[PDB]
Design a protein around this ligand. Structure first.
Ligand SMILES: Nc1ncnc2c1ncn2[C@@H]1O[C@H](COP(=O)(O)OP(=O)(O)O)[C@@H](O)[C@H]1O
Ligand SMILES: Nc1ncnc2c1ncn2[C@@H]1O[C@H](COP(=O)(O)OP(=O)(O)O)[C@@H](O)[C@H]1O
Ligand code: SF4
Ligand code: SF4
Ligand SMILES: [Mg+2]
Ligand SMILES: [Mg+2]
Lengths: 272, 272
Protein backbone atom coordinates (compact mmCIF):
# COMPACT_ATOMS: atom_id res chain seq x y z
CA UNK A 1 0.00 0.00 0.00
CA UNK A 2 0.99 3.63 -0.44
CA UNK A 3 -0.87 6.77 0.54
CA UNK A 4 -1.46 9.27 -2.23
CA UNK A 5 -1.88 12.82 -0.94
CA UNK A 6 -2.28 16.14 -2.66
CA UNK A 7 -1.61 19.58 -1.22
CA UNK A 8 -3.85 22.30 -2.68
CA UNK A 9 -4.26 25.99 -1.88
CA UNK A 10 -4.04 29.48 -3.29
CA UNK A 11 -0.83 30.76 -4.83
CA UNK A 12 1.78 31.93 -2.34
CA UNK A 13 0.01 30.43 0.67
CA UNK A 14 2.86 28.03 1.53
CA UNK A 15 2.11 24.78 -0.34
CA UNK A 16 5.65 24.04 -1.47
CA UNK A 17 7.34 25.09 1.78
CA UNK A 18 4.87 23.05 3.83
CA UNK A 19 4.99 20.00 1.54
CA UNK A 20 8.77 19.81 1.35
CA UNK A 21 9.21 20.27 5.11
CA UNK A 22 6.44 17.75 5.89
CA UNK A 23 8.06 15.25 3.50
CA UNK A 24 11.54 15.84 4.98
CA UNK A 25 10.07 15.02 8.40
CA UNK A 26 8.50 11.83 7.01
CA UNK A 27 11.85 10.82 5.55
CA UNK A 28 13.56 11.60 8.87
CA UNK A 29 11.00 9.18 10.40
CA UNK A 30 12.04 6.44 7.96
CA UNK A 31 9.31 6.78 5.31
CA UNK A 32 9.94 6.47 1.57
CA UNK A 33 8.34 9.43 -0.22
CA UNK A 34 7.95 10.87 -3.74
CA UNK A 35 7.04 14.51 -4.46
CA UNK A 36 5.35 15.33 -7.78
CA UNK A 37 5.29 19.04 -8.56
CA UNK A 38 2.00 20.05 -10.24
CA UNK A 39 2.43 23.83 -10.21
CA UNK A 40 3.84 25.66 -13.28
CA UNK A 41 6.19 27.65 -11.00
CA UNK A 42 8.14 24.34 -10.87
CA UNK A 43 10.08 25.00 -7.63
CA UNK A 44 8.22 22.36 -5.53
CA UNK A 45 11.31 20.13 -5.11
CA UNK A 46 14.19 22.63 -4.82
CA UNK A 47 14.50 22.36 -1.02
CA UNK A 48 14.84 18.57 -1.17
CA UNK A 49 17.34 18.73 -4.08
CA UNK A 50 19.28 21.77 -2.77
CA UNK A 51 18.73 23.17 -6.24
CA UNK A 52 17.62 26.24 -8.17
CA UNK A 53 14.57 24.25 -9.25
CA UNK A 54 14.24 21.05 -11.30
CA UNK A 55 14.04 20.46 -15.04
CA UNK A 56 10.50 19.47 -15.93
CA UNK A 57 9.04 16.46 -17.70
CA UNK A 58 7.64 18.79 -20.38
CA UNK A 59 11.11 20.26 -20.95
CA UNK A 60 12.92 16.92 -20.95
CA UNK A 61 10.37 15.32 -23.29
CA UNK A 62 10.87 18.16 -25.79
CA UNK A 63 14.67 17.90 -25.66
CA UNK A 64 14.51 14.10 -26.04
CA UNK A 65 11.93 13.97 -28.85
CA UNK A 66 8.98 12.31 -27.13
CA UNK A 67 8.07 11.46 -23.57
CA UNK A 68 8.65 7.82 -24.59
CA UNK A 69 12.35 8.57 -25.04
CA UNK A 70 12.54 9.40 -21.32
CA UNK A 71 13.34 6.80 -18.70
CA UNK A 72 12.09 7.13 -15.14
CA UNK A 73 15.62 6.90 -13.74
CA UNK A 74 16.38 9.92 -15.96
CA UNK A 75 13.64 12.19 -14.62
CA UNK A 76 13.27 11.25 -10.96
CA UNK A 77 15.93 12.81 -8.75
CA UNK A 78 16.67 11.96 -5.11
CA UNK A 79 17.64 14.50 -2.45
CA UNK A 80 17.42 14.85 1.32
CA UNK A 81 16.54 11.59 3.05
CA UNK A 82 16.26 9.74 -0.25
CA UNK A 83 13.09 11.63 -1.17
CA UNK A 84 12.35 11.24 -4.89
CA UNK A 85 11.37 14.36 -6.84
CA UNK A 86 9.83 15.21 -10.21
CA UNK A 87 8.33 18.38 -11.75
CA UNK A 88 5.53 18.39 -14.33
CA UNK A 89 6.14 21.76 -15.93
CA UNK A 90 3.65 23.47 -18.17
CA UNK A 91 3.27 25.59 -21.29
CA UNK A 92 4.56 29.14 -21.34
CA UNK A 93 2.06 31.85 -20.36
CA UNK A 94 -0.48 32.65 -23.05
CA UNK A 95 -0.03 29.22 -24.67
CA UNK A 96 -2.41 26.29 -24.39
CA UNK A 97 -3.56 25.18 -20.94
CA UNK A 98 -1.41 25.90 -17.89
CA UNK A 99 -2.20 22.47 -16.41
CA UNK A 100 -1.43 20.33 -19.47
CA UNK A 101 1.95 19.22 -18.10
CA UNK A 102 0.34 17.62 -15.04
CA UNK A 103 -1.56 15.18 -17.23
CA UNK A 104 1.59 14.24 -19.14
CA UNK A 105 3.65 13.84 -15.96
CA UNK A 106 1.23 11.71 -13.96
CA UNK A 107 0.55 9.39 -16.90
CA UNK A 108 4.31 9.04 -17.48
CA UNK A 109 4.93 8.13 -13.85
CA UNK A 110 2.13 5.57 -13.83
CA UNK A 111 3.25 3.86 -17.05
CA UNK A 112 6.93 3.80 -16.12
CA UNK A 113 6.26 2.09 -12.78
CA UNK A 114 7.22 4.95 -10.47
CA UNK A 115 4.59 3.72 -8.00
CA UNK A 116 6.73 0.91 -6.61
CA UNK A 117 5.25 -0.97 -3.65
CA UNK A 118 8.09 0.27 -1.44
CA UNK A 119 6.93 3.90 -1.55
CA UNK A 120 4.99 4.84 1.58
CA UNK A 121 3.69 8.25 0.44
CA UNK A 122 3.29 10.24 -2.76
CA UNK A 123 2.63 13.98 -2.41
CA UNK A 124 1.32 16.10 -5.30
CA UNK A 125 1.90 19.88 -4.90
CA UNK A 126 -0.96 21.37 -6.95
CA UNK A 127 -1.87 24.91 -7.99
CA UNK A 128 -5.37 25.65 -6.61
CA UNK A 129 -6.36 29.13 -7.81
CA UNK A 130 -8.40 27.42 -10.56
CA UNK A 131 -9.69 23.86 -10.43
CA UNK A 132 -9.67 22.83 -14.07
CA UNK A 133 -7.56 21.18 -16.68
CA UNK A 134 -4.57 19.28 -15.36
CA UNK A 135 -5.01 20.91 -11.95
CA UNK A 136 -8.36 19.11 -11.57
CA UNK A 137 -6.97 15.85 -12.95
CA UNK A 138 -5.69 14.52 -9.56
CA UNK A 139 -9.28 14.83 -8.31
CA UNK A 140 -11.18 13.89 -11.47
CA UNK A 141 -8.99 10.88 -12.23
CA UNK A 142 -8.64 9.56 -8.67
CA UNK A 143 -4.91 10.20 -8.24
CA UNK A 144 -4.85 12.16 -4.96
CA UNK A 145 -7.00 10.19 -2.54
CA UNK A 146 -6.26 12.46 0.46
CA UNK A 147 -6.37 16.21 -0.12
CA UNK A 148 -4.92 18.63 2.42
CA UNK A 149 -5.60 22.33 1.82
CA UNK A 150 -3.11 24.92 3.04
CA UNK A 151 -4.89 28.13 4.02
CA UNK A 152 -4.84 31.07 6.42
CA UNK A 153 -7.22 33.63 7.89
CA UNK A 154 -6.96 35.55 4.60
CA UNK A 155 -10.36 35.68 2.92
CA UNK A 156 -8.88 34.65 -0.46
CA UNK A 157 -7.18 31.61 1.10
CA UNK A 158 -10.44 30.48 2.71
CA UNK A 159 -12.31 31.10 -0.55
CA UNK A 160 -9.80 28.88 -2.34
CA UNK A 161 -10.30 26.15 0.27
CA UNK A 162 -14.05 26.30 -0.34
CA UNK A 163 -13.57 26.17 -4.11
CA UNK A 164 -11.27 23.13 -3.92
CA UNK A 165 -13.87 21.47 -1.67
CA UNK A 166 -16.55 22.04 -4.34
CA UNK A 167 -14.33 20.22 -6.83
CA UNK A 168 -14.03 17.26 -4.46
CA UNK A 169 -17.83 17.10 -4.12
CA UNK A 170 -18.24 17.23 -7.91
CA UNK A 171 -16.37 13.91 -8.33
CA UNK A 172 -17.69 12.15 -5.21
CA UNK A 173 -19.53 9.50 -7.24
CA UNK A 174 -16.34 8.13 -8.83
CA UNK A 175 -13.06 7.10 -7.24
CA UNK A 176 -12.21 7.84 -3.63
CA UNK A 177 -10.86 11.40 -3.49
CA UNK A 178 -11.61 12.93 -0.07
CA UNK A 179 -10.74 16.01 2.00
CA UNK A 180 -8.25 15.05 4.73
CA UNK A 181 -7.93 18.38 6.51
CA UNK A 182 -6.96 22.03 6.51
CA UNK A 183 -3.43 23.18 7.36
CA UNK A 184 -3.28 26.72 8.74
CA UNK A 185 -0.10 28.50 7.63
CA UNK A 186 -0.13 31.43 9.99
CA UNK A 187 -0.07 35.14 9.23
CA UNK A 188 0.52 35.36 13.00
CA UNK A 189 -2.80 37.05 13.74
CA UNK A 190 -4.97 36.63 16.83
CA UNK A 191 -7.43 33.72 16.98
CA UNK A 192 -6.37 32.67 13.47
CA UNK A 193 -6.16 29.07 14.65
CA UNK A 194 -9.72 29.27 15.98
CA UNK A 195 -10.88 30.74 12.66
CA UNK A 196 -9.48 27.86 10.62
CA UNK A 197 -10.82 25.30 13.11
CA UNK A 198 -14.26 26.88 12.65
CA UNK A 199 -13.94 26.73 8.85
CA UNK A 200 -12.85 23.08 9.01
CA UNK A 201 -15.83 22.25 11.23
CA UNK A 202 -18.23 23.89 8.77
CA UNK A 203 -16.74 21.90 5.87
CA UNK A 204 -16.92 18.71 7.93
CA UNK A 205 -13.16 18.19 8.25
CA UNK A 206 -10.52 19.21 10.82
CA UNK A 207 -7.59 21.58 11.05
CA UNK A 208 -4.77 19.07 11.14
CA UNK A 209 -2.06 21.50 12.26
CA UNK A 210 -1.35 25.20 12.83
CA UNK A 211 2.03 26.10 11.28
CA UNK A 212 3.46 29.30 12.83
CA UNK A 213 5.11 32.06 10.84
CA UNK A 214 8.86 31.69 11.50
CA UNK A 215 11.76 33.56 9.91
CA UNK A 216 13.87 30.39 10.10
CA UNK A 217 11.91 29.28 7.02
CA UNK A 218 13.47 32.06 4.94
CA UNK A 219 16.96 31.43 6.33
CA UNK A 220 16.64 27.76 5.37
CA UNK A 221 15.21 28.48 1.91
CA UNK A 222 17.94 31.03 1.08
CA UNK A 223 20.25 28.02 1.46
CA UNK A 224 17.88 25.79 -0.60
CA UNK A 225 17.06 23.60 2.40
CA UNK A 226 14.09 22.49 4.43
CA UNK A 227 14.08 23.64 8.05
CA UNK A 228 14.25 19.92 8.95
CA UNK A 229 17.67 19.72 7.28
CA UNK A 230 18.88 23.30 7.91
CA UNK A 231 18.25 23.39 11.69
CA UNK A 232 16.87 20.12 13.08
CA UNK A 233 16.76 21.69 16.59
CA UNK A 234 14.50 24.58 15.54
CA UNK A 235 11.07 24.96 17.09
CA UNK A 236 9.72 25.18 13.54
CA UNK A 237 11.31 21.82 12.73
CA UNK A 238 9.28 20.32 15.57
CA UNK A 239 6.16 22.00 14.13
CA UNK A 240 6.68 20.20 10.82
CA UNK A 241 7.38 16.93 12.66
CA UNK A 242 4.06 17.36 14.46
CA UNK A 243 2.26 18.00 11.17
CA UNK A 244 3.85 14.91 9.63
CA UNK A 245 2.85 12.69 12.58
CA UNK A 246 -0.73 13.91 12.39
CA UNK A 247 -0.93 13.28 8.63
CA UNK A 248 0.41 9.74 9.20
CA UNK A 249 -2.16 9.11 11.95
CA UNK A 250 -5.11 10.84 10.26
CA UNK A 251 -8.20 8.67 9.75
CA UNK A 252 -10.80 11.36 8.86
CA UNK A 253 -11.33 11.57 5.07
CA UNK A 254 -14.64 13.14 4.08
CA UNK A 255 -16.74 14.43 1.22
CA UNK A 256 -16.75 18.08 2.35
CA UNK A 257 -19.72 20.39 2.76
CA UNK A 258 -18.91 23.65 0.92
CA UNK A 259 -20.25 26.82 2.52
CA UNK A 260 -21.91 29.96 1.18
CA UNK A 261 -20.20 33.31 0.76
CA UNK A 262 -22.44 34.60 3.57
CA UNK A 263 -21.13 31.89 5.92
CA UNK A 264 -17.54 32.76 4.98
CA UNK A 265 -18.10 36.47 5.59
CA UNK A 266 -19.75 35.75 8.93
CA UNK A 267 -16.73 33.70 10.05
CA UNK A 268 -14.38 36.58 9.27
CA UNK A 269 -16.61 39.17 10.94
CA UNK A 270 -16.99 37.02 14.04
CA UNK A 271 -13.29 36.35 14.66
CA UNK A 272 -12.34 39.99 13.94
CA UNK B 1 -12.16 56.98 -28.50
CA UNK B 2 -12.18 54.92 -25.31
CA UNK B 3 -9.28 53.47 -23.37
CA UNK B 4 -9.44 49.75 -22.70
CA UNK B 5 -7.47 48.72 -19.62
CA UNK B 6 -7.05 45.44 -17.84
CA UNK B 7 -5.95 44.89 -14.26
CA UNK B 8 -4.04 41.62 -13.74
CA UNK B 9 -2.28 40.14 -10.72
CA UNK B 10 -2.17 37.18 -8.39
CA UNK B 11 -5.22 36.16 -6.39
CA UNK B 12 -5.84 38.22 -3.27
CA UNK B 13 -3.34 40.92 -4.19
CA UNK B 14 -5.95 43.71 -4.38
CA UNK B 15 -7.15 43.80 -8.01
CA UNK B 16 -10.84 44.29 -7.30
CA UNK B 17 -10.36 46.76 -4.44
CA UNK B 18 -7.89 48.80 -6.48
CA UNK B 19 -9.95 48.68 -9.69
CA UNK B 20 -13.23 49.69 -8.07
CA UNK B 21 -11.64 52.55 -6.09
CA UNK B 22 -9.67 53.76 -9.14
CA UNK B 23 -12.87 53.69 -11.22
CA UNK B 24 -14.87 55.51 -8.51
CA UNK B 25 -12.22 58.24 -8.60
CA UNK B 26 -12.49 58.45 -12.40
CA UNK B 27 -16.26 58.78 -12.11
CA UNK B 28 -15.84 61.46 -9.43
CA UNK B 29 -13.65 63.26 -12.02
CA UNK B 30 -16.47 63.12 -14.59
CA UNK B 31 -15.40 60.08 -16.63
CA UNK B 32 -17.83 57.47 -17.97
CA UNK B 33 -16.54 53.99 -17.07
CA UNK B 34 -17.52 50.32 -17.44
CA UNK B 35 -16.10 47.51 -15.27
CA UNK B 36 -16.09 43.96 -16.68
CA UNK B 37 -15.37 41.31 -14.07
CA UNK B 38 -13.18 38.52 -15.50
CA UNK B 39 -12.47 36.60 -12.28
CA UNK B 40 -14.61 33.57 -11.31
CA UNK B 41 -14.90 34.94 -7.74
CA UNK B 42 -17.38 37.39 -9.35
CA UNK B 43 -17.22 40.14 -6.69
CA UNK B 44 -15.40 42.72 -8.89
CA UNK B 45 -18.38 45.13 -9.00
CA UNK B 46 -19.93 44.80 -5.52
CA UNK B 47 -18.41 48.04 -4.16
CA UNK B 48 -19.83 50.08 -7.05
CA UNK B 49 -23.26 48.39 -6.79
CA UNK B 50 -23.39 48.31 -2.95
CA UNK B 51 -24.22 44.64 -3.41
CA UNK B 52 -23.39 41.15 -2.24
CA UNK B 53 -21.95 40.52 -5.70
CA UNK B 54 -23.56 40.55 -9.16
CA UNK B 55 -25.37 37.86 -11.12
CA UNK B 56 -23.14 36.71 -13.95
CA UNK B 57 -23.64 36.53 -17.70
CA UNK B 58 -23.13 32.76 -17.54
CA UNK B 59 -25.87 32.48 -14.91
CA UNK B 60 -28.31 34.80 -16.67
CA UNK B 61 -27.78 33.11 -20.04
CA UNK B 62 -28.61 29.73 -18.48
CA UNK B 63 -31.77 31.03 -16.80
CA UNK B 64 -32.88 32.76 -20.02
CA UNK B 65 -32.15 29.90 -22.43
CA UNK B 66 -29.33 31.33 -24.53
CA UNK B 67 -27.09 34.35 -24.32
CA UNK B 68 -29.08 35.70 -27.30
CA UNK B 69 -32.15 35.97 -25.07
CA UNK B 70 -30.27 38.50 -22.93
CA UNK B 71 -30.39 42.22 -23.62
CA UNK B 72 -27.53 44.50 -22.64
CA UNK B 73 -29.84 46.72 -20.58
CA UNK B 74 -30.71 43.53 -18.65
CA UNK B 75 -27.15 42.59 -17.69
CA UNK B 76 -25.33 45.89 -17.25
CA UNK B 77 -26.02 47.54 -13.90
CA UNK B 78 -25.11 51.08 -12.85
CA UNK B 79 -23.91 52.07 -9.38
CA UNK B 80 -21.80 54.79 -7.81
CA UNK B 81 -21.14 57.69 -10.16
CA UNK B 82 -23.03 56.01 -12.99
CA UNK B 83 -20.32 53.37 -13.39
CA UNK B 84 -21.62 50.44 -15.44
CA UNK B 85 -20.88 46.92 -14.18
CA UNK B 86 -21.00 43.36 -15.51
CA UNK B 87 -19.63 40.00 -14.31
CA UNK B 88 -18.56 37.17 -16.62
CA UNK B 89 -18.90 34.24 -14.25
CA UNK B 90 -17.45 30.84 -14.95
CA UNK B 91 -18.05 27.11 -14.62
CA UNK B 92 -18.15 25.49 -11.21
CA UNK B 93 -14.85 24.10 -9.92
CA UNK B 94 -13.82 20.83 -11.53
CA UNK B 95 -15.95 21.54 -14.62
CA UNK B 96 -14.66 22.69 -17.99
CA UNK B 97 -12.34 25.70 -18.14
CA UNK B 98 -12.44 28.33 -15.39
CA UNK B 99 -12.03 31.15 -17.93
CA UNK B 100 -14.74 30.10 -20.39
CA UNK B 101 -17.19 32.74 -19.11
CA UNK B 102 -14.82 35.58 -20.01
CA UNK B 103 -14.99 34.65 -23.69
CA UNK B 104 -18.79 34.53 -23.61
CA UNK B 105 -19.06 37.83 -21.75
CA UNK B 106 -16.68 39.91 -23.85
CA UNK B 107 -18.20 38.65 -27.11
CA UNK B 108 -21.69 39.43 -25.78
CA UNK B 109 -20.70 42.97 -24.84
CA UNK B 110 -19.09 43.60 -28.22
CA UNK B 111 -22.05 42.30 -30.23
CA UNK B 112 -24.66 44.10 -28.14
CA UNK B 113 -22.97 47.49 -28.57
CA UNK B 114 -21.84 48.02 -24.98
CA UNK B 115 -18.81 49.91 -26.31
CA UNK B 116 -20.69 53.13 -26.97
CA UNK B 117 -18.55 56.08 -28.07
CA UNK B 118 -19.49 57.95 -24.89
CA UNK B 119 -17.56 55.56 -22.62
CA UNK B 120 -14.17 56.99 -21.66
CA UNK B 121 -12.70 53.85 -20.01
CA UNK B 122 -13.37 50.13 -19.83
CA UNK B 123 -11.60 48.19 -17.07
CA UNK B 124 -11.33 44.38 -17.10
CA UNK B 125 -10.56 42.80 -13.69
CA UNK B 126 -8.76 39.57 -14.66
CA UNK B 127 -7.53 36.56 -12.70
CA UNK B 128 -3.76 36.27 -13.30
CA UNK B 129 -2.54 33.14 -11.48
CA UNK B 130 -2.67 31.33 -14.84
CA UNK B 131 -2.53 33.02 -18.23
CA UNK B 132 -4.60 30.71 -20.40
CA UNK B 133 -8.08 30.13 -21.65
CA UNK B 134 -10.44 33.05 -21.21
CA UNK B 135 -7.97 34.73 -18.87
CA UNK B 136 -5.52 35.07 -21.77
CA UNK B 137 -8.25 36.16 -24.18
CA UNK B 138 -8.03 39.91 -23.35
CA UNK B 139 -4.36 39.73 -24.38
CA UNK B 140 -4.59 37.21 -27.23
CA UNK B 141 -7.61 38.87 -28.83
CA UNK B 142 -6.54 42.50 -28.37
CA UNK B 143 -9.25 43.53 -25.90
CA UNK B 144 -7.15 45.08 -23.09
CA UNK B 145 -4.75 47.46 -24.79
CA UNK B 146 -3.27 48.80 -21.52
CA UNK B 147 -2.41 46.27 -18.82
CA UNK B 148 -1.70 47.36 -15.25
CA UNK B 149 -0.39 44.68 -12.89
CA UNK B 150 -1.14 44.92 -9.17
CA UNK B 151 1.70 43.46 -7.14
CA UNK B 152 3.65 43.76 -3.89
CA UNK B 153 7.06 42.86 -2.47
CA UNK B 154 5.78 39.29 -2.05
CA UNK B 155 7.81 36.94 -4.23
CA UNK B 156 4.66 35.25 -5.59
CA UNK B 157 3.15 38.61 -6.59
CA UNK B 158 6.32 39.59 -8.46
CA UNK B 159 6.46 36.15 -10.10
CA UNK B 160 2.90 36.65 -11.30
CA UNK B 161 3.81 40.06 -12.73
CA UNK B 162 6.66 38.45 -14.65
CA UNK B 163 4.40 35.67 -15.94
CA UNK B 164 1.74 38.12 -17.15
CA UNK B 165 4.52 40.07 -18.88
CA UNK B 166 5.60 36.90 -20.73
CA UNK B 167 2.05 36.55 -22.02
CA UNK B 168 2.12 40.12 -23.34
CA UNK B 169 5.39 39.41 -25.17
CA UNK B 170 3.92 36.24 -26.69
CA UNK B 171 1.24 38.24 -28.56
CA UNK B 172 3.36 41.29 -29.43
CA UNK B 173 3.15 40.62 -33.17
CA UNK B 174 -0.64 41.00 -33.30
CA UNK B 175 -2.87 43.73 -31.93
CA UNK B 176 -1.61 46.42 -29.58
CA UNK B 177 -1.67 44.97 -26.05
CA UNK B 178 1.04 46.62 -23.94
CA UNK B 179 2.18 46.83 -20.31
CA UNK B 180 1.18 50.21 -18.84
CA UNK B 181 2.71 49.89 -15.39
CA UNK B 182 2.92 48.17 -12.03
CA UNK B 183 0.73 49.21 -9.09
CA UNK B 184 2.27 48.41 -5.70
CA UNK B 185 -0.41 47.44 -3.17
CA UNK B 186 1.59 47.71 0.02
CA UNK B 187 2.21 45.10 2.69
CA UNK B 188 3.61 48.13 4.57
CA UNK B 189 7.19 46.85 4.56
CA UNK B 190 10.37 48.92 4.33
CA UNK B 191 11.66 49.95 0.89
CA UNK B 192 8.79 48.04 -0.73
CA UNK B 193 8.18 50.99 -3.04
CA UNK B 194 11.84 50.93 -4.11
CA UNK B 195 11.59 47.19 -4.75
CA UNK B 196 8.64 47.53 -7.12
CA UNK B 197 10.25 50.53 -8.86
CA UNK B 198 13.31 48.33 -9.45
CA UNK B 199 11.16 45.51 -10.84
CA UNK B 200 9.32 47.93 -13.13
CA UNK B 201 12.62 49.30 -14.41
CA UNK B 202 13.88 45.79 -15.19
CA UNK B 203 10.68 45.00 -17.13
CA UNK B 204 10.94 48.32 -18.97
CA UNK B 205 7.83 49.90 -17.43
CA UNK B 206 7.18 52.12 -14.38
CA UNK B 207 5.52 51.83 -11.00
CA UNK B 208 2.53 54.06 -11.58
CA UNK B 209 1.51 54.37 -7.92
CA UNK B 210 2.23 53.00 -4.44
CA UNK B 211 -1.07 52.23 -2.67
CA UNK B 212 -0.60 52.12 1.13
CA UNK B 213 -2.16 49.50 3.37
CA UNK B 214 -5.06 51.27 5.15
CA UNK B 215 -7.71 49.80 7.45
CA UNK B 216 -10.25 52.27 6.03
CA UNK B 217 -10.43 49.90 3.05
CA UNK B 218 -11.95 47.17 5.24
CA UNK B 219 -14.34 49.59 6.94
CA UNK B 220 -15.57 50.74 3.53
CA UNK B 221 -15.86 47.22 2.12
CA UNK B 222 -17.82 45.93 5.15
CA UNK B 223 -20.39 48.52 4.03
CA UNK B 224 -20.05 47.45 0.35
CA UNK B 225 -18.53 50.78 -0.66
CA UNK B 226 -15.39 52.16 -2.22
CA UNK B 227 -13.30 54.39 0.04
CA UNK B 228 -14.05 57.17 -2.48
CA UNK B 229 -17.75 56.92 -1.61
CA UNK B 230 -17.44 55.81 2.04
CA UNK B 231 -15.06 58.57 3.22
CA UNK B 232 -14.16 61.07 0.49
CA UNK B 233 -11.92 62.95 2.98
CA UNK B 234 -9.75 59.92 3.78
CA UNK B 235 -6.05 59.98 2.99
CA UNK B 236 -6.60 56.67 1.18
CA UNK B 237 -9.25 58.31 -1.01
CA UNK B 238 -6.60 60.81 -2.11
CA UNK B 239 -4.25 57.88 -2.84
CA UNK B 240 -6.79 56.38 -5.25
CA UNK B 241 -7.39 59.82 -6.80
CA UNK B 242 -3.64 60.08 -7.41
CA UNK B 243 -3.58 56.62 -9.00
CA UNK B 244 -6.51 57.54 -11.24
CA UNK B 245 -4.86 60.80 -12.38
CA UNK B 246 -1.65 58.98 -13.23
CA UNK B 247 -3.49 56.30 -15.23
CA UNK B 248 -5.31 59.06 -17.16
CA UNK B 249 -2.02 60.85 -17.89
CA UNK B 250 0.09 57.74 -18.58
CA UNK B 251 1.79 57.66 -21.98
CA UNK B 252 4.26 54.76 -21.45
CA UNK B 253 2.93 51.51 -22.96
CA UNK B 254 5.62 48.94 -23.70
CA UNK B 255 6.33 45.40 -24.76
CA UNK B 256 7.91 44.30 -21.46
CA UNK B 257 11.21 42.53 -20.93
CA UNK B 258 10.56 39.53 -18.64
CA UNK B 259 13.33 38.69 -16.18
CA UNK B 260 14.93 35.45 -15.02
CA UNK B 261 14.26 33.77 -11.69
CA UNK B 262 17.83 34.67 -10.71
CA UNK B 263 17.13 38.37 -11.34
CA UNK B 264 13.94 38.15 -9.26
CA UNK B 265 15.74 36.45 -6.37
CA UNK B 266 18.53 39.03 -6.49
CA UNK B 267 16.00 41.88 -6.23
CA UNK B 268 14.47 40.35 -3.11
CA UNK B 269 17.86 39.63 -1.52
CA UNK B 270 19.08 43.15 -2.24
CA UNK B 271 16.13 45.04 -0.74
CA UNK B 272 16.01 42.75 2.32
N1 LIG C 1 5.44 29.15 8.01
C1 LIG C 1 6.15 30.05 7.33
N2 LIG C 1 6.92 30.97 7.94
C2 LIG C 1 7.63 31.87 7.22
N3 LIG C 1 7.61 31.91 5.87
C3 LIG C 1 6.85 31.04 5.16
C4 LIG C 1 6.07 30.04 5.87
N4 LIG C 1 5.42 29.29 4.94
C5 LIG C 1 5.77 29.78 3.72
N5 LIG C 1 6.62 30.81 3.88
C6 LIG C 1 7.21 31.59 2.79
O1 LIG C 1 6.13 32.05 1.96
C7 LIG C 1 6.56 32.06 0.58
C8 LIG C 1 5.57 31.25 -0.27
O2 LIG C 1 5.58 29.88 0.13
P1 LIG C 1 5.41 28.75 -1.00
O3 LIG C 1 5.42 27.44 -0.26
O4 LIG C 1 6.41 28.97 -2.10
O5 LIG C 1 3.91 29.05 -1.56
P2 LIG C 1 3.09 28.26 -2.70
O6 LIG C 1 3.88 27.01 -3.01
O7 LIG C 1 1.75 28.00 -2.04
O8 LIG C 1 3.03 29.24 -3.86
C9 LIG C 1 7.98 31.52 0.56
O9 LIG C 1 8.92 32.61 0.50
C10 LIG C 1 8.16 30.82 1.88
O10 LIG C 1 9.50 30.91 2.37
N1 LIG D 1 -4.63 48.95 0.18
C1 LIG D 1 -5.30 48.11 0.98
N2 LIG D 1 -5.38 48.31 2.31
C2 LIG D 1 -6.07 47.44 3.09
N3 LIG D 1 -6.69 46.35 2.61
C3 LIG D 1 -6.65 46.06 1.29
C4 LIG D 1 -5.94 46.94 0.38
N4 LIG D 1 -6.06 46.43 -0.86
C5 LIG D 1 -6.81 45.30 -0.77
N5 LIG D 1 -7.15 45.10 0.52
C6 LIG D 1 -7.95 43.98 1.01
O1 LIG D 1 -7.32 42.77 0.55
C7 LIG D 1 -8.35 41.80 0.25
C8 LIG D 1 -8.17 41.29 -1.19
O2 LIG D 1 -8.36 42.35 -2.12
P1 LIG D 1 -9.09 42.03 -3.52
O3 LIG D 1 -9.10 43.33 -4.27
O4 LIG D 1 -10.39 41.32 -3.27
O5 LIG D 1 -8.04 41.00 -4.22
P2 LIG D 1 -8.13 40.30 -5.67
O6 LIG D 1 -9.29 40.96 -6.38
O7 LIG D 1 -6.77 40.59 -6.27
O8 LIG D 1 -8.37 38.84 -5.35
C9 LIG D 1 -9.69 42.47 0.50
O9 LIG D 1 -10.19 42.09 1.80
C10 LIG D 1 -9.39 43.95 0.53
O10 LIG D 1 -10.23 44.65 1.43
S1 SF4 E 1 -8.31 28.16 -17.18
FE1 SF4 E 1 -6.29 27.52 -18.07
S2 SF4 E 1 -6.86 26.75 -20.17
FE2 SF4 E 1 -8.78 26.73 -18.93
S1 SF4 F 1 -5.75 25.73 -16.69
FE1 SF4 F 1 -8.04 25.94 -16.54
S2 SF4 F 1 -8.80 24.53 -18.21
FE2 SF4 F 1 -6.61 24.99 -18.70
MG1 LIG G 1 4.72 26.28 -4.79
MG1 LIG H 1 -11.05 40.19 -7.22
Amino acid sequence: AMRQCAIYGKGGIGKSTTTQNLVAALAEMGKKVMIVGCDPKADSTRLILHSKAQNTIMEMAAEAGTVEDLELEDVLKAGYGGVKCVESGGPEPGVGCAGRGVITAINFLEEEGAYEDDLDFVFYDVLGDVVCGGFAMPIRENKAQEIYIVCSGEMMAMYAANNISKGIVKYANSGSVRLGGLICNSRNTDREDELIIALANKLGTQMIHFVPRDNVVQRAEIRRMTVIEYDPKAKQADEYRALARKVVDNKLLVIPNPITMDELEELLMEFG
